[PDB]
Design an enzyme around this catalytic site. Structure first.
Site, mmCIF file in Angstrom:
data_model
loop_
_atom_site.group_PDB
_atom_site.id
_atom_site.type_symbol
_atom_site.label_atom_id
_atom_site.label_comp_id
_atom_site.label_asym_id
_atom_site.label_seq_id
_atom_site.Cartn_x
_atom_site.Cartn_y
_atom_site.Cartn_z
ATOM 1 N N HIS A 119 0.815 -1.219 0.000
ATOM 2 C CA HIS A 119 0.000 0.000 0.000
ATOM 3 C C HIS A 119 0.839 1.255 0.000
ATOM 4 C CE1 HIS A 119 -3.463 2.433 0.476
ATOM 5 N NE2 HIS A 119 -4.211 1.497 1.013
ATOM 6 N N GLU A 164 -4.034 -0.479 -5.679
ATOM 7 C CA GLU A 164 -4.120 0.624 -6.623
ATOM 8 C C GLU A 164 -2.843 0.777 -7.420
ATOM 9 O OE1 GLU A 164 -5.627 4.294 -5.290
ATOM 10 O OE2 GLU A 164 -7.335 3.448 -4.321
ATOM 11 N N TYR A 295 -14.468 6.238 -5.615
ATOM 12 C CA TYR A 295 -14.841 7.453 -4.877
ATOM 13 C C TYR A 295 -15.766 8.414 -5.624
ATOM 14 C CZ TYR A 295 -11.049 5.853 -1.826
ATOM 15 O OH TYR A 295 -10.277 5.118 -0.983
#
Ligand SMILES: OC[C@H]1O[C@@H](O[C@H]2[C@H](O)[C@@H](O)[C@H](O[C@H]3[C@H](O)[C@@H](O)[C@H](O[C@H]4[C@H](O)[C@@H](O)[C@H](O)O[C@@H]4CO)O[C@@H]3CO)O[C@@H]2CO)[C@H](O)[C@@H](O)[C@@H]1O
Length: 445
Positions: A119, A164, A295
Site C-alpha cells: 500500500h 491501486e 470514490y
C-alpha cells in the site's frame, strides 16, 4: 424502500500502514519513499508527514477493540514493507512481531483480517536502487511477499496483493503527485508493468505454498462521462477510461494492454521493451476476487495541451466532499455494472475502499457527520441495486476506520468514521460509525 443485503455479505473497514501507524523510526523500521517525499517543499499540504499519524503503532489494541464494539466482522490493513525489510535481505523480526501481535488482537476480538501486501510505502533503500523502474524490485518484492506468507497465512483468510497500481505508478513516477515524485512517463509505464507483475509474483508464491486464503488485487476505478456530445470529447473520455481503468484491468483479465492506449502513448512505451517473454501471463491472474476502490467519477473534455492525455476534467461543484470530489452514486452503479460485463464476468467483487472526507466539528463530544453518512448510504444503495440485478458484490469495506495521513492532502482531509484528536490521540466514533453499527446489525437499513 428497504435495503437488505445478502446473508454472507462482508462488512469491514480499511486502513493502510503509513497512513495510521506512526512509529516511523521505531522498532527497526527505516524510511519509506513517503517519509522522503513528504519533505519536499510543496508536495504535501502543510508540509505534513506520516510521523506519529494516529499512532496506531501503540494504540493497536484499542483500535481493534473499537472495531469489535462498532460491530465489525472484517478488518483490512496493510503491512509496511519498511518494517519488514529495512535493508537489503535482512528480515527485521521486531516488525514481523508487530503484525503478529496485531493479528493476535484481531482473532481475539473475533475479527477476520485481510492483509494488503503493498500500500505505497516502498522502503527508500529500494528507491535508491531505482525503485519501481527496475525489474530487480520485483525480486525484492518476492522476498517480502514470501516472509509474510510463511510467517502467516495459516492465519490469513483474505490476501490483497497490490493496492491501486495506478497511483503508485502513474502519480508516483508520472505526474509527480505521489512518492517518490518523478515526472517521467517512460518510468511511470515501466513502474506500472513492474507493480502489476508483483501481483503475479505474489499470486505464484501463494499457489507454490498451497495456502487456502482468497487472493486478489485492488484497482481504483472511476466512471467516465464525456463533457458534451462533441466527438473530440467522446474520444477524450475513452482516453481517461483507458488511462485509469483499462491499462490495469486489461492485463489482469485478458493478458494485454489496451491497444488504443499503447498507440496513444507511443514513444513513451519504447516499443513495450520493458515487457519480457512471460510477463503478461504472470500478470493475468484475477485470482479469487476483484478488489475495487471507488470514490467519484470524472467528466472529461478534450484539450490540445502539453499533457500526456490532452484532457481536461470539468470541475463539477454539485454535491462534493471537502476534497472537491463529486458525490454521484448512480455512477458507482454504472461502474459496477461495467466491471462485471468486461473483465470480471462472474468473479466475486469486493469494495475494498469507499468513503468520503467532509469537514468535521466536535459538538458536545459527538460528530454529526451527516454528509459522510449520506454519502456512504447512497453508495450502499448503488451497491444494492447491483446485487439483486445479479451482481457479484460480496463485500464492502468503508474507507478509513480512522482519520489519517491523507497523502498529498495531509491531515487536512478526514475520511474516518472514527474521529482522531491529533492533540491527545483519543478516538471518538462519529454519528456515521454509530449508523454503520445499527446498519450491520439489521444487515441493511
Ligand atoms: O486522498 C485520499 C484517497 O485518494 C486516492 O488517490 C487519489 C488522490 O487523492 C488524488 O490526488 C488523485 O486526483 C487525480 C484525479 O483523479 C485526476 O482527475 C487527475 O488527472 C489530472 C492530471 O493530474 C493532469 O495531468 C491533467 O492536465 O488533467 C487531469 C484532470 O483533468 O490528477 C489527479 C492527481 O492530482 O486521484 C486518486 C484517485 O484516482 C486513493 O485512491 C484512496 O486510497 C484515498 O483514500
Amino acid at each position: 424502500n428497504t435495503f437488505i443485503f445478502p446473508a454472507t455479505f462482508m462488512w469491514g473497514t480499511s486502513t493502510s500502514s503509513y497512513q495510521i501507524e506512526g512509529g516511523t523510526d521505531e522498532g527497526g523500521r527505516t524510511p519509506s519513499i513517503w517519509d522522503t517525499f513528504c519533505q519536499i517543499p510543496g508536495k504535501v499540504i502543510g508540509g505534513d508527514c506520516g510521523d506519529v499519524a494516529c499512532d496506531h503503532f501503540h494504540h493497536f489494541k484499542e483500535d481493534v477493540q473499537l472495531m469489535k464494539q462498532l460491530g465489525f466482522l472484517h478488518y483490512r490493513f496493510s503491512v509496511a514493507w519498511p518494517r519488514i525489510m529495512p535493508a537489503a535481505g535482512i528480515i527485521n523480526e521486531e516488525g514481523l512481531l508487530f503484525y503478529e501481535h496485531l493479528l493476535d488482537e484481531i482473532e481475539l476480538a473475533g475479527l477476520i483480517p485481510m492483509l494488503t501486501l503493498y500500500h505505497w510505502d516502498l522502503p527508500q533503500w529500494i528507491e535508491d536502487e531505482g525503485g519501481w523502474t527496475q525489474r530487480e524490485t520485483i525480486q525484492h518484492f518476492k522476498t517480502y511477499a514470501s516472509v509474510i506468507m510463511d510467517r502467516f497465512g495459516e492465519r490469513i483468510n483474505w490476501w490483497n496483493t497490490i493496492n491501486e497500481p495506478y497511483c503508485a505508478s502513474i502519480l508516483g513516477y508520472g505526474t509527480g503527485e505521489h512518492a517518490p515524485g518523478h515526472e517521467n512517463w517512460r518510468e511511470a509505464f515501466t513502474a506500472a508493468h513492474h507493480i502489476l507483475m508483483c501481483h503475479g509474483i505474489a499470486s505464484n508464491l501463494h499457489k507454490e505454498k498451497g495456502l487456502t486464503g482468497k487472493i486478489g488485487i485492488t484497482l481504483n476505478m472511476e466512471h467516465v462521462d464525456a463533457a458534451s456530445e462533441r466527438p473530440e470529447d467522446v474520444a477524450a473520455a475513452i482516453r481517461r477510461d483507458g488511462f485509469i481503468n483499462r491499462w490495469f484491468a486489461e492485463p489482469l483479465f485478458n493478458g494485454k494492454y489496451p491497444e488504443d492506449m499503447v498507440e496513444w502513448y507511443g514513444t513513451y512505451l519504447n516499443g513495450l521493451d520493458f515487457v519480457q517473454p512471460g510477463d503478461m501471463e504472470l500478470i493475468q491472474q484475477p485470482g479469487d476476487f476483484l478488489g475495487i476502490n471507488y470514490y467519484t467519477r470524472s467528466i472529461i473534455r478534450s484539450t490540445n495541451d502539453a499533457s500526456l492525455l490532452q484532457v481536461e476534467q470539468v470541475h463539477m461543484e454539485e454535491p462534493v466532499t471537502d476534497m472537491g470530489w463529486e458525490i454521484h452514486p448512480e455512477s458507482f452503479y454504472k461502474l459496477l455494472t461495467r466491471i462485471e460485463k468486461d473483465f470480471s464476468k462472474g468473479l466475486p467483487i469486493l469494495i475494498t475502499e469507499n468513503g468520503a472526507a467532509m469537514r468535521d466539528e466536535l459538538v458536545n463530544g459527538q460528530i454529526e457527520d451527516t454528509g459522510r453518512q449520506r454519502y456512504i448510504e447512497e453508495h450502499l444503495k448503488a451497491c444494492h441495486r447491483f446485487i439483486e440485478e445479479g451482481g457479484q458484490l460480496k463485500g464492502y469495506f468503508v474507507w478509513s476506520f480512522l482519520d489519517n495521513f491523507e497523502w498529498a492532502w495531509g491531515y487536512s482531509k478526514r475520511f474516518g468514521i472514527v474521529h482522531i484528536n491529533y492533540e491527545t490521540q483519543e478516538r471518538t466514533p462519529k454519528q456515521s460509525a454509530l449508523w454503520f453499527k445499527q446498519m450491520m446489525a439489521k444487515n441493511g437499513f
